[PDB]
C-alpha cells in the first residue's frame, strides 16, 4: 500500500 | 543547569532550519491569512459538507510539509523506507496540530491552517474533528504561557517523529537513540532559555497531550472517495 507516500519519500 | 553541548547546538540548528523551511507562509502567516466566512461550520441539524470540503482541500499540502520536515533531518533519512512510513503515519496529525496551535490568535479565537485560513473552534469541530477540535484549541490556549520559539517547536516535532512506540518498526532501538538525542538537546535548550514558567515537566505533559490528539485517528475516521488519497494513506 501507501503508493504515493512512498513516492514522496524517494522524491 | 546544563546547557547544550557543541554537538547539540549543531543538532538544534539543523532541526530548527528544517522547521522554518517547512512552516507554511513562514512569518507572513498572520497577514496572508483569511477568516473562513463564519456561515461555514455551523451545527448541522452529522457533518457540515461545506466546511468539510475546505479541510480536504488543505490537508494534502499540510501533510506534505511534514514530509518535507523529516526529509531535512539526516537522522530520519538513514532509516529504511518502511520505518519512515510508519514514523510518518504516526506523527503527521500530531505535528500539524502542533503547528496549528502555535498559531492561536486570542484576539480572534482562531487557529491558522496552512498559513492562510483562520478557523474558529466551532468551524473546526463541525468540519469533522469533533472533540479533537477542543483538544487542539486547548493546546494553543495553554501554549501561550510557554512562549515556544521556532527551535522549541522544532524539537517538539522531532520528539514526536522519533517514536519507537509505533507498531511495525524494524529499527526500534535506532529510533529510540535519535529521540534521546533530541530529548536531551531539548532540555538543555530549555535550561539555557530560562523560561519563567516548573518548565519541562509541563512541556513533557504537552507531548502526551499531542500523542492523545494523534491516537484519535480511529475516533475521527462521507464516502472514502471524498478524502484526498494522501490523507487516506496516513490515517
Ligand atoms: C490539524 C490540522 N492542521 C492543519 C494545518 O494546516 N496546520 C497548520 C500547519 O501545519 O501549518 C490542516 O490543514 C488540517 C486540515 C484538516 C484537518 O482535519 C480534517 C481532515 C479532513 C476532513 C476534515 C478535517 C486537520 C488539520
Numbering used by the authors:
A (entry chain C): 741 to 751
B (entry chain A): 211 to 255, 263 to 414, 416 to 439, 446 to 459
Quote the paper.
The thyroid hormone receptors (THRs) are nuclear hormone receptors regulated by endogenous thyroid hormones, including the inactive prohormone thyroxine (T4) and the bioactive hormone 3,3′,5-triiodothyronine (T3), which are critical for development regulation and metabolic homeostasis. As ligand-regulated nuclear receptors, THRs have a structurally conserved LBD that allows the binding of distinct ligands (Burris et al., 2013). Although the defects in any of the processes in thyroid hormone transport and synthesis can all contribute to RTH, in most cases the disorder involves defective thyroid hormone receptors, resulting in reduced T3 binding and disruptive thyroid hormone signaling.
As expected, the native ligand T3 abolished or substantially diminished the transcriptional activity of four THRβ mutants associated with thyroid hormone resistance, V264D, H435L, R438H, and R438W, respectively (Wakasaki et al., 2016, Nomura et al., 1996, Sabet and Pallotta, 2011, Narumi et al., 2010). Surprisingly, the treatment of roxadustat either enhanced or retained the transcriptional activity of these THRβ mutants, all leading to higher induced transcriptional activity than those of T3. The structural analysis further revealed an apparent conformational change of residue H435 on helix 10 of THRβ for all four mutants, resulting in the loss of a critical hydrogen bond between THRβ and a critical hydroxy group of T3, which is also conserved for the other THR ligands identified so far, explaining the severely reduced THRβ activity by T3. Specifically, in addition to the direct mutation of H435 to the hydrophobic leucine of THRβ H435L, the allosteric conformational changes of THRβ H435 were coupled with several intermediate structural changes, predominantly in helix 10, which were initiated by mutants R438H, R438W, or V264D, consequently leading to impaired T3 binding.
